[PDB]
Each structure stands twice: as C-alpha cells, then as structure tokens.
Amino acid sequence: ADEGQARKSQLQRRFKEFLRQYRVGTDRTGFTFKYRDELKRHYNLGEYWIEVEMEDLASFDEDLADYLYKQPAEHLQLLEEAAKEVADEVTRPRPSGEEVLQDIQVMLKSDASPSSIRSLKSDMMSHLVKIPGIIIAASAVRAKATRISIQCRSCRNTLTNIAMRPGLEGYALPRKCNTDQAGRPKCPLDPYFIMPDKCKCVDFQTLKLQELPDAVPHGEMPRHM
Amino acid sequence: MFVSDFRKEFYEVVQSQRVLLFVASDVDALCACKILQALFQCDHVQYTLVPVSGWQELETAFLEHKEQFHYFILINCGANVDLLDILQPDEDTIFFVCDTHRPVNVVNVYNDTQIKLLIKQDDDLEVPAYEDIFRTMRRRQRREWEARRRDILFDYEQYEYHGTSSAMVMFELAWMLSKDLNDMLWWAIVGLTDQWVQDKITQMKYVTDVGVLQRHVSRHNHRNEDEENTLSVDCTRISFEYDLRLVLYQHWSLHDSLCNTSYTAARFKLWSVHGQKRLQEFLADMGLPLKQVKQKFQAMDISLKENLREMIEESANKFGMKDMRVQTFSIHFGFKHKFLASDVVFATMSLMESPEKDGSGTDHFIQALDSLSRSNLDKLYHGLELAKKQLRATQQTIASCLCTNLVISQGPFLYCSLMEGTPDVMLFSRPASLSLLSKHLLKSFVCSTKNRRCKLLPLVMAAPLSMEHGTVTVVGIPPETDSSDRKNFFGRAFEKAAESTSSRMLHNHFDLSVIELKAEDRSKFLDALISLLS
C-alpha cells in the first residue's frame, strides 16, 4: 500500500536533512558543512559521488544508521536520491551543457572493526558487512542496465523506465501483455522485448577477494569471496 | 594565613598586577590553571605561566623570575612545605597558594604577611594552636613545653592527604565574580574527577563534591534552556550521569573496557589464565554476544545499549560487584563529540605522562594543557588513544608483577620493584604514572591473594629512574580497604628511615610519599622501614 511510500518519503527527507545539516568543527574555531561542500565540489569537478561516514550518520540520527546496517539495499537508494536532491539545490543554477541533473553514487565507510570472510554466515544475509582481504582477480569493466523499456511485439504496448535492481540480480519480463484486453492473439508467451535505443547503463566489475594470509585457520586454504 | 574571601583579598589584589603562575603537573592543577587563565584573559591581567614538575625546578623558576614579579600563584604546590625557607623570598613578595595537599605547614598557616592560602576553611583541617607551637623550674617547664610541641607537631604532620579540588576552588572564585562559563564548570568537574580517578579523596567526599557540582550544572543548564526552548547543537551541554565505572568504554570496545578497567580486571583476575572464563561467564549472564562486546562501542548494535548501564549493575550485583555505577558527568557538543569526565581525565593525564622521548616533560605539559580547550579536539582524541595504550601497558605490568610474584610481604608493608629493561618500565618511570600503577596493582593483589593478613597491608613500590646518576623512584601507598580514609604515613616514614640510615634520599616530587633514592641505599632504607613500622 501507499503507506510504504509515505515511509519512504519521510526516510528520504531525513537523509536529505542529514546531508543538508551535518557539520564538523567547534564554535571556538568554526564550522564546515562537510557533505554539502563535498557534493558541490565533486559535482563541479564532474565526479558525481560522495562517501558518507556511518559514524557521522549515526551521530546525526542513529535510527538511519541502524536502518542502513540492517537493510542497506532498501535505504541506500533513498540516501542516494536525497544526495541527488541536495546536489541539485547546492549547484543550481548550472551553466549551459550542465542543465540535466546527474545521479550521485553514495559510498560508505566506517570506523568499525571488520569481520572475516569466515565470519560471513547465513544469519547476516542482506546485511551490511565490513571485511578485509586481497584482490586476486578483476574482470573487464562491462555495462549493467539501470533503466530499460520493453515493448510488446503484437500491439507495441510499451513499459517505460523500468527500474533494474542493483547487483547481480536480473529482471523478469512480464509473462502476459500488460494493461490491455485479452484480444486475438491473447499473448505469445514472451510478448515483450527490450527496446535497443532506450537502455541506460552503468559500468560494473567483478572481483575476487581472497582471505588475508594471517586470517586463515591452520591447515586450510584461503577462502574466496 | 587563610584567605577568607577569594574575590576581595586575592583576585581584586592580583587583578591590578603582573602575576606569575607556577603550575604543578597534574590534571586538577591544569584545570585550575585553565579557569584562572580564563579569568585573567577576561580582565587583561598580564600573567606569565610556568610549568613546574618538582620542588627543585620550582626553586629554579623562582630564582629566574623573582626580580620581575611581586605576586606569585602556586597551583597544586607549596602548601605542605615552608615556602619561606624553600624559596628564600624578598620581604615584600606575595605567594598565593591554591593547593590540595594536606596538612598545611604551620609556618604557612601562621605567616600573616607573605603566604596567603587559597584554601577553604571548612576542609578537613585541624591546625594546632599557635601557643602550642611557637614562642631552674622555668627552663624545666620550657623544655617540657618543647617536648609537648614535638609530640603535637608529629601528630599533626604524620598523615598526608588531599582536600578540596583546586579547580573547584577557582570555579567558586569564578562564580563569585560571575564570570563562570560552562567550560569553566567542565574544568572544575574534570579536576574533581582527577581526584577521584587517582583516589586522592574518599568516596564520601567525592559524592559530596558531586552534589555541590550538580547544582552548578543545573544552573548552567537553565541559563538559556528548558523543556521547550533549546539551544543549537554547537553549544556545550553538561549532564549529570549515574554512569558505569568502566574506563573509556564509549571510545573502544566494551571488551577492552572490562579488560583494562582496574576494578573489573582485579575482580575477574584477568592477569590469570582462568579469569577470562569468569569474564565470559559474566558476559553470558548479561546476554551480550561476544562479537558485539568486542566491537567498538559506537559500532555496537543500538538495541543492546539503551539499558546497558542497569543491565551491568544487575549482573554485577549477583556477581558481587555491588558498586559498578558511579555519580559522574558528561559533556556534549556538536553532533558527535561526547566525553565522560573520566575520559577527559585519562586523556589529559596520558598527554602529561606520555612515554614519548621527543621534546620534554614541559612540552607534554603543554600538549595536555592545550587538549583541555575545544579548539584542540584533535589533541584530546590523540590523548584518548595514548590513554588506551597506557591502560593496556598498566594491565601487562600488573600481570607481570603478580605472575612473577614480585610483590612480597615485607612484614609491615608489601614490597614490589620494577626492573630495568623490562617492558614499559620507561612508561612507568614517571612518578604520577608509577603511583597509579602501584594503586591498581595493590587492588589487583588484594583481589588475588587468599590470605586475610595480606588484604590489609600497605604497599611500597620501586622503579628505576636514573643510570647517569643511578637512582630509583619509590612510592608508598596506603591499604586498599573500603573502610580506608585515604591518608598515608609514608611521606614521614620515608624521611625517618632516610635520616636513620643517612641515605641519599632526594625529595623533589610535591607528594611526600614519593621520593628519589640512590640504588645502593634501598637495602638499608628498606631495613629501616621494617624497623620503623614494626
């Protein structure tokens, strides 16, 4: 129901107020708006990313930090959308050729002590984890779709800007044609195809993280993640 | 003589003058210096500040500066010796003395012209009357009076102890002037907490002084604030806390706090191999996961923390630790800066007694003094890291002493000695850190041993000091009973032994119960101490 969207709106507002109001310093010396300033400078440099500290977020509002730890996938996109809002209201107006607002990648770092690869057990699935290791392999950079549009082969009925879930998860095309009547033919079994010219894609990479040599139990080979 | 009114007879006098501050190297002295600096900077009093780590460098600084200054202020030094004889001043200088050390020297008390004691008259003071101390059958009664004088004055000078915090005295001055800022109240709190952390006062007196400071905290918390009008996050908020006795536990893991706190380390006997299972039993009784307990406190799950203090108290009561809570204070400002008074005490103390060889002890004083101002929060956090290192080194040293059985009962008193070249001895070579080590080690020993006799003894500890001159630092500690009144006789016992043996004893530290001794004379010095305490 739309009460979930109400919850999303208020949580996005709280992330926006974190990025709008957080300061570092003291009244004896002076204050700087850390994340506003980083957003402004990175956007003007054409970087379109910031890195947020979990302890800063927890000091501002500990519930948001707890939500990010427990349910990072759900709340990180709200944080990124709030970052996009703050970037807009921090950089507006922009010169010609920069009118269209860009998406902001929000990265995370923390002062917390890390876990091992062998600490990752089924209780922690979908939770936010911090682990060390060595990069032993790295793939070529490739394209992952973030937005697609799909068109029906019979009636040319189109679904636009389908949100693609991040990560190695894919997307299921609809089994039957959407929103129009069961005419003749009703449906060929895959009615939809992905339109070639409308996809928005981002870079992605696959890497292998090896366990640290001093973390390995005696007699065992280092694990991979 | 005692200053009756600090505003009228001390501050309004030195307000018009150039002043020289001699400041001792301890956190209470630093806090009093910060408060007095703030008042002088408000009034444009052209002061000069000199750190002094001992009597000889106090004498050196006075010899350097006596020509140019007529008004001197001694912070946590001078009250327990004859300053006139020590410094040999000109006839028309003035020495204001704000010092916690007791008993006050009788010459300091009854000097009515030159020595002015910034000491509260309602402290634990019992001065002998003037006629008992100062001027055929007539000469026979003269000799009898002199014998009675020796008896009475020994009874007066026997037990050394500490009175009200100098930071609290200077805060009362600031309050009377009505220039008492919230950071000045915080510095007063930190001075009292320094006294409590170093066990210089009884728990009753600490609770009474906390009761005094609570009212000032309430006044400052209602100067511009109530339940419906509130200030910026920039402003400092001091809050009364019935917090936990664990050390630095909001800045590292609860596991490290339980391991490196003196009380819980002593009770669980974590120096021993078996004690870690006792601690694990305590944590399992609480129901805290070990991963959360070993995680940093700020990164611990928030569902574990919002009743942690009463959970700790409830489990501690059924484990026999009946007083895990303590009445203390905290300061908040900004979004993320939060400190207990104990945290600030340990950070500043570590910055003073740092093991770093670069610079000098006065440079480390300067680092500690800077760290008490909020313009040097980086210095405060660096001090917190140094405090974590210091606490860990303290526990390793206690474990070494108890495991090797260096603590041997020398009849009247337990005896311990650090050895040159062993780990962290250079960190503990400084007398303040050595005093803290000896107190923590005595608590650990009393919890360790099963003999009823050993639980009541005092302790004497020695450590190397010098090889260019071949000397050791020796400290004396009273017994660690809960009934103790925190008074000790070792300041006078040491000099009685030293004069009985004609030992090469040097007496530079401001506490009489800490001495420097030639490494050869320690044998006969200890023999005299056993003979003396009997």
Ligand SMILES: [Zn+2]
């Ligand atoms: Zn269709």
